[PDB]
Structures are given as C-alpha cells and as structure tokens.
Design a protein around this ligand. Sequence first.
Ligand SMILES: NC(=O)c1ccc[n+]([C@@H]2O[C@H](COP(=O)([O-])OP(=O)(O)OC[C@H]3O[C@@H](n4cnc5c(N)ncnc54)[C@H](O)[C@@H]3O)[C@@H](O)[C@H]2O)c1
Ligand SMILES: NC(=O)c1ccc[n+]([C@@H]2O[C@H](COP(=O)([O-])OP(=O)(O)OC[C@H]3O[C@@H](n4cnc5c(N)ncnc54)[C@H](O)[C@@H]3O)[C@@H](O)[C@H]2O)c1
Ligand SMILES: NC(=O)c1ccc[n+]([C@@H]2O[C@H](COP(=O)([O-])OP(=O)(O)OC[C@H]3O[C@@H](n4cnc5c(N)ncnc54)[C@H](O)[C@@H]3O)[C@@H](O)[C@H]2O)c1
Ligand SMILES: NC(=O)c1ccc[n+]([C@@H]2O[C@H](COP(=O)([O-])OP(=O)(O)OC[C@H]3O[C@@H](n4cnc5c(N)ncnc54)[C@H](O)[C@@H]3O)[C@@H](O)[C@H]2O)c1
Ligand code: NA
Ligand code: NA
Lengths: 260, 260, 260, 260
Amino acid sequence: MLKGKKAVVTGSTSGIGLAMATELAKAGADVVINGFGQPEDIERERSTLESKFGVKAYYLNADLSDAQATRDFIAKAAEALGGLDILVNNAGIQHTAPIEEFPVDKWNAIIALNLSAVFHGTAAALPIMQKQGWGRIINIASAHGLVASVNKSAYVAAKHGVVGLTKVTALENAGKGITCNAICPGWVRTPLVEKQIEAISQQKGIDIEAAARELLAEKQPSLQFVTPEQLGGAAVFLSSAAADQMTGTTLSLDGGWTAR
Amino acid sequence: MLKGKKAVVTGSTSGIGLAMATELAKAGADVVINGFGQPEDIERERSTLESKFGVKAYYLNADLSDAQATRDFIAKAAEALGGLDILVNNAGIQHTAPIEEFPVDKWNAIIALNLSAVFHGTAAALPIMQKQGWGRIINIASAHGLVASVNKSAYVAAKHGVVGLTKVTALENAGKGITCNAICPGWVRTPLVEKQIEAISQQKGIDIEAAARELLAEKQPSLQFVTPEQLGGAAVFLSSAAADQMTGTTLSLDGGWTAR
Amino acid sequence: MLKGKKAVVTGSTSGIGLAMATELAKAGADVVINGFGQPEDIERERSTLESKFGVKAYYLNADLSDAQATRDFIAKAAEALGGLDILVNNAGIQHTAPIEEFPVDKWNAIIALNLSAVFHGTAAALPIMQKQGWGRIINIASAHGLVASVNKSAYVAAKHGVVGLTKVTALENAGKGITCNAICPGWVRTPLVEKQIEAISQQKGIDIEAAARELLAEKQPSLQFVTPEQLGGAAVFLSSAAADQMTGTTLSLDGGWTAR
Amino acid sequence: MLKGKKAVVTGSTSGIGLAMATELAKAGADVVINGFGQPEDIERERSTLESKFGVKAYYLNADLSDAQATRDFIAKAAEALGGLDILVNNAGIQHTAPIEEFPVDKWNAIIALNLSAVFHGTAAALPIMQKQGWGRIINIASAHGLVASVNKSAYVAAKHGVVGLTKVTALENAGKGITCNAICPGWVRTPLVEKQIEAISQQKGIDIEAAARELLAEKQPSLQFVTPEQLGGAAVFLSSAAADQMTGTTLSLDGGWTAR
Ligand SMILES: NC(=O)c1ccc[n+]([C@@H]2O[C@H](COP(=O)([O-])OP(=O)(O)OC[C@H]3O[C@@H](n4cnc5c(N)ncnc54)[C@H](O)[C@@H]3O)[C@@H](O)[C@H]2O)c1
Ligand SMILES: NC(=O)c1ccc[n+]([C@@H]2O[C@H](COP(=O)([O-])OP(=O)(O)OC[C@H]3O[C@@H](n4cnc5c(N)ncnc54)[C@H](O)[C@@H]3O)[C@@H](O)[C@H]2O)c1
Ligand SMILES: NC(=O)c1ccc[n+]([C@@H]2O[C@H](COP(=O)([O-])OP(=O)(O)OC[C@H]3O[C@@H](n4cnc5c(N)ncnc54)[C@H](O)[C@@H]3O)[C@@H](O)[C@H]2O)c1
Ligand SMILES: NC(=O)c1ccc[n+]([C@@H]2O[C@H](COP(=O)([O-])OP(=O)(O)OC[C@H]3O[C@@H](n4cnc5c(N)ncnc54)[C@H](O)[C@@H]3O)[C@@H](O)[C@H]2O)c1
Ligand code: NA
Ligand code: NA
C-alpha cells in the first residue's frame, strides 16, 4: 500500500480513471482527479474519495488536448499534493471510421489526447520524480497498442505510440527509482465501449446484450469484460515494491486478445 | 491473499522457486516444493514454510526432465494438497556455448526441463483445475522468451517455446476460471547467474562484482538485479482477482531489457 | 518488375527515399519524387530518373507536415502519373533530447511528418487503389517502431504509431488487392544519421569513423550499416507478386538490432 | 539470382519445401531435396529439377527427427553439392488436440522435427558457411511462431522455439556474411492444412470448400491462402544481396493474421 503517496490520474471523472483513483485512494494515496462531466457529479466523486478513504483529493479541470494546459495541470497538481509520486496517464477518446473517411479533426483530437498528452504530462512530472529519486508513470494504452482492428486508425496509431513512449521514458530513467509501464486492457464496459456495443446492435438488429456478446466474441477469448477494478489493482501492483524492476513494458489484461 | 489455496512450485528447493513458494505460503497457500539439493537443507526449507507461515508444506522429489515422472509428480502433489489451485512451472537449467559447439545432450536436457516439463505439468494439472472452475498456471520464462542472446540457443528456444505454450494454454481454457501467464525476468542473482558472472570474471580478469556490473550493463538498463522476492510478488499478483482477465500474456520484470 | 506501375515516394530528394525512387524506376515504374533541397540538385535527380531508366518522373514540392498539403500532393501525384499503384511514405525527421527537455515544437513536427503524413497520404491514396483493385502502401518505419532508445521520445512514438497504422491499413483493405507493410531499418548512413555520428564524435573526442563504429556497436550486431539500395530492393520485393499475401507486417532490415 | 549457389531444403518432397527447391533451382542453385513419399514421385521431382532448370539435384533420405541422422544428412548434402550456401529448414508435422489429451509421443515428435531438427541442421551447416564467409539459413516457422491457436500446443511451442533459435543463430553469426531468418506463413493449402479443412468440414457438416473458407475467415483477413510459390519467392529474396543486413527476424506472409 501507498500511504503518504501523491497520485495524479488524468481522465478520472469516470470510467477506468475513476476506478484508478479509487484504488489509489484506498491504498492510502492523496489523489488529483481530472476530466469532464457534470460539476455536481465530479464534486461528489472528489468528496467521496476523502470521506470514504481518509485521503486528500483535488479536482483540476484541464483539457489535456492542449500541451501547455497539460504541463500547467501537472504543475498545479504537484502544488496541490505537495509532490507527485504516481502519474496515471489515462484520459482518452475513440472514433471509428475507415481511413479514407476518417475525419482529419478526429485524427488530430485522438493524437492530441491519447498520445501527445502522455508526452506532455510525463515531461512535466519527470523532474519532480527525478529530484526525489522515486516515481511511477503508468500509461493506459490498450490491446490496440500491440495489435490493430479495422476502423481505428487514429486510436491504434496513438496507442502504439504510447507503448513506444513508455519504453523511452523507462530507458531514460532506468535505475533512477522511476519506472514507466503501459497497462494494455482489452474490452472494459465503460461508455467508450457502450457506444460501440450500441453501434453493433443497430448494424445487426439485435438487443444490446447480444451485441455485447458479439463484441467480446470477436476479440476477447475469455468472453468476459475486463473490469475497471481489476485495472485499478494492476495500477496498485505497478506502484508496489515488487514492481521496482518492472519498467518499459506492457501489462496486458485482455482476456486472451493478444495471445492469438 | 490466498488462504485455503493449494500451490505447487517446481524447482523450489532454491533460487527463484523457493522465493515463489515462500510468498505463496505467506499469502496463506499450502505448498508442494520440488527440486534437488542436500536433504537436510530441503527439509529445513519445508519445515520452515510450516513453522513461519502456518501452512502445510510437502517436498516431492521428481526429476522433471522425465515426462511420466512429471505427470506422476502432479498427481502426487494434488493428492498431498487435497487439490491443486496454482501451478508454478519454474524448474530450469542453463548451458552456454555457440550453436556449432552446443552439446546435443545439453540441448536435449534444456528442452526436456525448460520446455517439455511445462507441457507435461500443465497437462496433468489442467483437469483438476477444469473440474473446480478455477486455476492459475504461472510459467517462469525469461526475457529470453522474447529476445535472444548469443550462446544460448537451447535456452532461448525453450523459453520462446514456453511463451507459446502459455498462450495456447490460456486460449484453450479461456473463460473457464483458469488463467495461464509467463513471468519473464531479467537477471536475478541466483546460482544460475552466478556461474555466468564467474565466467565473465575469468574471461575479463576482473573481480566478481565488476563482472556482475558488466553482466547487468550489457542487458539490463536499470543496472540492478531483479530479486526473487519481487518475482514472488508478481506470482501473488497473478494469483489475485485483479488478474482474473490477465491470461495468455507475459509479465516482464527485466529492468528495461526488452524495452530496447 | 514493375513496368507500367505508377509510384510516389515521399521525401525522395535524398537519402533512403531517393534510393527507393531509383529502384522503382529501374524496375520500370514512373515516379513522383518529393522533398526539400537545392532546386538544381532536385531537377538533376528528376531528369536522371528519366534519362537512365526511361520512365517518366515528376517532382512535386509539398511540405507534408501539413495535412491538406499532403492530401493535395497525392491528388497532384495521381494526376501527373495517370494513376497511383505504389505509395512509399518515407519522409521523416529526427531530433534527440531527453523527454523533459524535448522541445514541444519538435515533438509536434516529428508527429506531424513522421506519423500524421503517413495517415493523410494513405487516406488520399486508398480510394484510387480501391477502385483499381491493386495497390501497395510501403511505410518506412524503423527499428524504433518496435523498440526504443533514449532521447528519441517523439521519433519512437511516431514510428510505433506508423507500425500500428500499417496494421490498420492492411486490415481495412484485406483481400482487396492492396497490401500495406512497414520496412523497419536499422542504421543507414544518411545525413539523418551522420548528424548523430558527429554528435557522438564530439561527446567522446574521437574521429568520425570511430564514432560510426561506436554507433553501430551499441545497436546493430552486424557492425555494418544497412544501405539505401538494400531498402530499395525490399520495396521492390514488397511490390512483387510474391508479396501479395504479405500485409500488415514489418520487414526489419536491421543487422540484428531487434533480435536481441 | 543464385547461379552457382548450393542449397539444401529439408522436407522438399512435397508442399512448401518442394516449391522452395523449385524456386531456388530456377534461380540457378543446385539443390538437395529430402523427405518422405513414393520413390517414383520423389525421383520424378529430382529429375525434373535437373531437366527443367539445368541444375544438379540430389535426394537424400533422412528422418530428421533423429539428431545424428540430421547432422549426417547435412554432411552428405554438402559432400554432394561440393559446399553449402543456403539451408532451408522446412520439414514439419502437425497434430491437433487439447493439451490434456495431447499425445506425449506427438509432443515429442513435433518438438523433434519442428524444433530440434532446425538446431541440429543449423549446427552442422554453420561451420561450412563460417569458413566461406557467406551463408543463408532460412527457417520455416509459422504465424504460430508469433501467436497461438487452440489445440496446437506442441506446434506453437516448437514454432516459437524456431523463432528464438533463429535470433540466436543470427546474433552468433552477425557480421560473418551469414544471415538467419524465419519465414512465418499463414495458411497454405498443402496436405498439412487439407487435413484440418477436412476435419472442420466433418465437425460442421459442410462441403470442403465451405470449410476452407471458414478456416481462412477465422485467422487470415485476406480470405486467401498464401501460396507455396510466394514463399519460394520470399526465400529467393532472403538469399539476395538486398537481404545482406536482414538477419534475426521474421518475415510474415500471412494475409494479415498477425496484424490483429
Ligand atoms: N474501455 C475500454 O475498453 C478500454 C480498453 C483499453 C484502453 N482504454 C483506455 O482507457 C482510457 C480510459 O477509457 P474509458 O473507457 O474509461 O473512457 P471514458 O470515456 O469512460 O472516460 C474518459 C475519461 O477521460 C476524460 N477526458 C476526455 N477528454 C478529455 C480531455 N480532453 N482532457 C481531459 N480529460 C478528458 C473524460 O472526462 C473521462 O474522465 C482511455 O485512454 C482508453 O483509450 C479503454
Ligand atoms: N536467474 C535468472 O536470472 C533467471 C532469469 C529469468 C528466468 N529464470 C528462470 O527461473 C527459473 C529458476 O531459475 P533459478 O535462477 O532460480 O535457478 P536455480 O539454478 O537457482 O534453481 C533451479 C531449481 O530447479 C531445480 N531443478 C533443476 N533441475 C531439475 C529437474 N530436472 N527436476 C526438478 N527440479 C530441477 C533445482 O534443484 C532448483 O530448485 C528457471 O526456469 C530459469 O530459466 C532465471
Ligand atoms: N537513416 C536511418 O538510419 C533510418 C533508419 C530507419 C528509418 N529511417 C527513416 O527513413 C526515412 C528517410 O530517412 P533518411 O535517413 O533518408 O533521411 P534524410 O534526412 O536523408 O532524408 C529525408 C527526406 O525527407 C525530406 N523531407 C524532410 N522534411 C520534409 C517535409 N516536411 N515534407 C516533405 N519532405 C520532407 C527531405 O527533403 C529528404 O528528401 C525517415 O522516415 C526515417 O525516419 C531512417
Ligand atoms: N501449410 C501451412 O499452412 C503452413 C503454414 C506455416 C508454416 N508451415 C510449415 O511449413 C513447413 C512445410 O509444411 P507443409 O504444409 O509443406 O507440409 P507437408 O506435410 O505438405 O510437407 C511436409 C514435408 O516434410 C517431410 N517430412 C515429414 N516428416 C519428416 C521427417 N521426419 N524427416 C524429413 N522430412 C519429413 C514430408 O515428407 C514433406 O516433404 C512445416 O514446417 C510447416 O510447419 C506450413
Ligand atoms: Na529488443
Ligand atoms: Na495477434
């Protein structure tokens, strides 16, 4: 556990990121959360981290598709926490279309958030971690950082990029007490995936749960979703001493996706 | 933690395997240990698992280079434990030489133990795990299951084989409550590596600790050994609920080896 | 050979790209070249393709860091050639620095050219190839699309991205007569690498050829550079019938870099 | 082309190997063929290589599941040819079953032929190639050297092993003028695959060509078989000067299998 640690999770107002923040707070870390949503919902989440788990929590709104806003977000997060031990670069978006129809603005948006924000956030965090001789950078990539699917050019490119960037970060900081790894989930039933399930259901003329089964069966041999709580557990493991020499690698929780 | 669980670790009389057994016993599992060594040392280890950690422990001697002996070992282990929830296929040997000089008997020995024993042990364990709808198979591969080094033809071939076999096991048992993953360590300073350090030291005419540094610097960017305790921690993570959808993959704890 | 084929090579005014164009022209393709340099040198190269190899050649200046300029370049190339059978996405730049010092504008420039231009060029080319039921898209990635090195965050991220994008392109166009693959070279002694050799030489206080040897020895087991002509040969192979079912993959010509 | 070169192809009495031998003979190499079959068919193939392509051809019967027989085969091949420039390690077998039912003798047979014979053949060939400062070792692995499928434990393990062994061979001989690479095909409609198609057809109660379509659709995005002639073309490319710095890698011709 992580008592005393200071953690930042991007895109933690909902989905995987919120489960990350929750597991980190449970383990005893103070947490900065981030992302979009209804103000009342976000404040309920912030206050819940504090009242359930007895840690400090802060919400810092920053649109991480902007480089300077990301760099400023990290600075503000570190100021709030009084340090920065663990950075989870999680915020991301999706858009599906074939390449020749793929909107240029969607390409740019996905590269900006899913790839460039990881770079800018890392760049801002590293000097803090380097000065204290301890850090964890945990990038949320995807099975799509290792393999491809149709109609996901920007996302697959970005996630592959994140895997590469994770490696560079690790190598540059090897031996310094700082590790960087990429968690690579398969399907997790958040709203990012519910939209894809809904789209299949309309294409096929089937109920939503039949469509969820079809989505799993195509990619994920276990035929079960990965959960946000499982991913939170993986982040806590990466943050532990057992993972001191785990750096520059991918941790796939994907129900067998990448085994075939 | 793993209270009530029944674990078998091959090649757990010393080295990584003994640390695996220790962490599993600490987490509350009963443990079957296995491997060669001085009878008094092995019995001290068995009795220590019991008296420190309050679990049952059994030592079953089996030379796992023999298929039938491996299959019989699993049966005897399951009988002793009253079940079999977690199998860690760890036993292995090494021999370095270039291919054209590599002894045929050493090729055969390394394939037999480092690869075939994983198959035979898995084959024996699976029906037990399938009937109870829960299992963990944890194969100890290597960074050398993903990349190569000179003079390690048999070992690299075997370890790559283990990574492949891990994938097949995972896919065949997808959704059944059984996962199979391969831990892929970089250098860990056991006697298997001390022999290689000694060999460098003689080649270079340097003290042993200088030779250990040279061994690390060539391969392992962190310039630190991975520890057996870290690997034990990884095994405990793989055995946890957070890893229910982690299957068919590799968990590299290698100080950056495979990032470059 | 490629008589009658219509090829476009980005960044073919010098370096690898010019060797690509040359091999394609030798094989009988008409070629559009592209890139920066002295006008007289570029025109000499264009006219040389024609007079040596008896093909048509065109130079179209476009700064491919701009999306619309890339898309317009493809349209103009296809108009010049009367079609578009083979697209080699080669143009790229490099900049070395550690992450926390890595200029934001250099990150943006490298992502724009080395990754985004591949997307925009592919997007523009695909409908042409889809309508004729034959095409080759050949992306020039790197060993750094598969593994990392220090101080190359943007480039490694971009090149990993290219490998991902190559996979998506291949899958979206599977069976259509169009393949997409990524050539992943190790060191090739162009000006992009000569700058790095010069930088080592100054850091170490050694002559340039000693520095070239040091650059090779660190990464490239063969201790020899890959040549632009070899890479041109690989492109010609990818464009051949033997490669009709080679799609979505990487072709490493790297002197062993990625084997270890 | 390969005029004057001396090539050996294991398991070249039929299937992929015979197409390998044919392309090598077409390119001007003398060829030793090997494998089982009807004596009259094998002699017709040998004599055809000579009369169509004007090269010398030899058939040497050796059961390559035996180490010493493999090593002796290489010696006899080199004696027949007057040298040995190109070795294609192709012979292989398949057997499908789940792990817990997988015959021990089939595990042993597949490891012996598909993995160990590659080692023994390489070991025998290397000193010949080392003394002349030129060689090509071309191992026929599979998509199953990179990823898994159910019911193929031994084969996947073996093929992964071959990929590892290829890397070691390459690294040990880096810079010596000898390269070693693994061709990794997807489905090729030989008798090894026809048996699997027939098995699907009986399971599903469908005609053989429907079953062939189902076999492709599951794994191979292009929905077309790879041909033996394509693979022969890849071998000829690997043997060319363009591939002098291609070593230690995999060349996937798999219709997109490994892209997803
Ligand atoms: N759901 C899956 O199956 C899955 C699988 C693998 C990887 N991923 C990755 O996990 C991460 C989280 O995905 P999720 O499924 O929880 O998605 P989600 O849509 O449920 O949550 C996205 C989060 O990011 C925030 N966000 C969006 N745009 C932002 C911006 N410009 N700046 C700051 N925050 C922003 C949202 O407000 C939200 O908090 C993403 O990187 C995604 O690619 C998801
Ligand atoms: N040490 C490292 O750096 C390292 C790194 C990666 C992977 N590995 C792998 O970890 C595993 C353990 O290695 P280690 O370094 O602890 O080695 P070790 O030599 O210290 O221990 C080997 C264990 O296996 C047992 N053993 C040997 N032959 C056996 C046989 N025929 N049957 C049953 N048991 C047998 C030994 O008695 C001992 O208990 C091996 O598979 C090895 O390949 C080790
Ligand atoms: N040299 C190597 O060792 C090596 C190895 C692997 C991959 N690569 C890749 O090969 C490709 C070519 O590299 P190179 O070594 O020949 O480099 P180079 O610097 O010699 O040539 C780069 C080419 O791209 C052009 N170019 C640059 N910016 C451009 C822009 N904005 N728009 C259009 N054209 C532009 C240049 O004018 C030139 O024609 C790059 O993608 C590089 O990443 C090179
Ligand atoms: N067919 C495919 O889809 C496919 C795909 C990828 C890889 N492969 C690999 O390609 C290689 C050739 O396969 P194929 O499909 O042509 O099979 P095949 O069954 O058509 O041919 C096998 C060849 O090996 C010979 N052989 C068998 N046992 C032997 C032994 N003990 N000693 C010497 N020779 C022996 C046979 O006589 C025959 O010449 C194998 O390694 C296989 O794993 C095949
Ligand atoms: Na590597
Ligand atoms: Na895959």
